[PDB]
Symmetry: D2
Subunit: 196 residues, 4 copies
């Protein structure tokens, strides 16, 4: 039902866009030259290209549960290697957000079940290493926001230790940014962690 | 530079949206109820929410190199488990597309280097098992398109063998769809593989 | 802590004995390694490659996981394979399945094993689905588990044979790949007839 | 194929010998397993857990990878841990690092090792970066490799101690976790003083 609506809406968007610019799709099929790799949360409220007000073809993206960057995870590392070594993107944006379900999960003391407890483990590690600080926050939603920000900082550290990324910094001046999307106001701010 | 422009454009989009609907962001921060899990390629030309002409909050998404669904990959499986067992999405859309870089990579005979040769291995396996058919296509771009379609079919098979997914089919009537986004015309079509 | 401390004690005893037998055994061990076999097997306590092959420390390079599963995108296994084939230049890759495999039995049952295990065993569950007719027709439970474990070895061999490092090393060095089966009841290892030749 | 066929031959000889020593050894082995130790170690050919601990097939459940690295999201290792702790109810988890570790040395060099290996070794490279002062001050290369391998054991222990299954099993069953180091030169295993107690 909603799937068939999504198909209808795709055809509508494509038709309107094809009238707007008869050369838009033919140039799009020609290739891509995105300048940003976006790594974010799978959350439905975080479509990178919409919330940044940009166009198809300029944001190369990876999205997972709680925007977690893990050192040995091959899924994410493939996206990073292709983006940095092949597409030569100039910016890497690791984005956390408010009301993150994975963050909230890591703050909980229960088994979420299945694969998720293992996937969220580096966030739980972030929980344990800042437990003093997180527990001191009386407001639950601000606690979820805080652990999401700390998760961004950690993910940035991992990114700054990625060899493909550091080669690109050293030779091309690749930039890395940790940002936070606040859904309540719809704004994205810098957390102050990254290349400079 | 383009990063700072992306921030400006985010603030602009947020401002305009906040005038359009003063309750949009406050309800967004309230929670999510997406009805679709979208699994697609990291390609910058494939932002799911734009090409489907939808809004932030209704498409839960995972994106990787060449939209590959691997049986033991925990990154993807976390997104699937959270989407199906916790968000209770009603549709899963595995989307391949034309001019896929990973597909083209799998069609090549060279080492792409780093982690990518290992990540694309299930696509290379698709290459080998349909080598007769793929080699018979004289046009390179149509060969890339074909292997991308076959990759979608394979990923669907894996999805249909995921336990979390099949439980949801058996008890909730979860639907699974394999689709293909043709960048040249901007349209998404069904490949005819999935639940029904 | 008792059994662990016993393990340390037995280590010290084994080291004392090995060192009296050959005073140059350990210094030569510490010099480097030149194993000729990469062993990929099940984590099963009953399957220690170096003991059952009656060989010595320094000649078998090994990776072991649940139900000896070789997955295409698994970075853990691929690292061991890459290091073994491209750095140590091993001449043989042995994928060894075995009888009474718990992971195999888990794949044959229809209940949730829980945690991460259903996902790890998913490619074995996939082998289950594609041979359901053959597997279900087997009246003996132990022979059904043995059979699904052997089919698992065959599948893993196919994956290894599609690995780029392995495939190149076959093409230029004559790297060999073998699918074998360790039958615990008789303690013997047989070839399954799948691999390089 | 010679060395592989020799391995099959030696297996048959070992099985013949083990079967004459104890005619009930193999049938009892085939009945099931009750290992009390989960061993996590390096794939290194010089580190076969069951030999160096001087124990028998059926009492050590093992996972082995490059440089014995325990990564939080690695599903391969987590499967072995889950099966060992929640199904077999092992009482001890032994993370064993060793001397002359190739992965350790790889992490200490600054060149690309190539393929998947830089990514797998990334958490060891991370340990390198955080202890660069200590590691660089070591004049002896072999003691630098040993040191980074020990720090790697310590880090892996921290990860194991944050694992939910391990943590629960500690809380209710008194599961124990030990960080150890196998020094190949003398063939002895020592405790690093990191773990449950
Ligand atoms: Cl053959
Ligand atoms: Cl202690
Ligand atoms: Zn989130
Ligand atoms: Zn693509
Ligand atoms: Zn087994
Ligand atoms: Zn080692």
């Amino acid at each position: 039902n909603t799937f068939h609506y999504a198909l209808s809406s795709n055809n509508a968007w494509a038709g309107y866009k094809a009238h707007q610019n008869p050369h838009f799709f033919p140039k799009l099929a020609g290739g891509q030259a995105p300048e940003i790799l976006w790594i974010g949360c799978s959350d439905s409220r975080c479509p990178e290209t919409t919330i940044l007000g940009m166009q198809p073809g300029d944001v190369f993206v990876h999205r997972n549960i709680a925007n977690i960057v893990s050192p040995t995870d091959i899924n994410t590392t493939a996206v990073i290697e292709y983006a940095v070594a092949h597409l030569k993107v100039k910016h890497i944006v690791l984005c956390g957000h408010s009301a993150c379900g994975g963050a909230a999960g890591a703050l909980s003391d229960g088994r979420i079940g299945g694969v998720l407890d293992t996937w969220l483990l580096p966030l739980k590690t972030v929980r344990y290493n800042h437990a003093e600080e997180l527990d001191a926050i009386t407001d639950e939603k601000e606690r979820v926001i805080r652990i999401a920000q700390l998760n961004v900082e950690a993910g940035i550290k991992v990114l700054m230790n990625n060899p493909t990324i550091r080669e690109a910094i050293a030779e091309r001046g690749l930039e890395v940014h940790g940002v936070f999307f606040d859904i309540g106001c719809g704004r994205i701010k810098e957390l102050g962690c990254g290349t400079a």
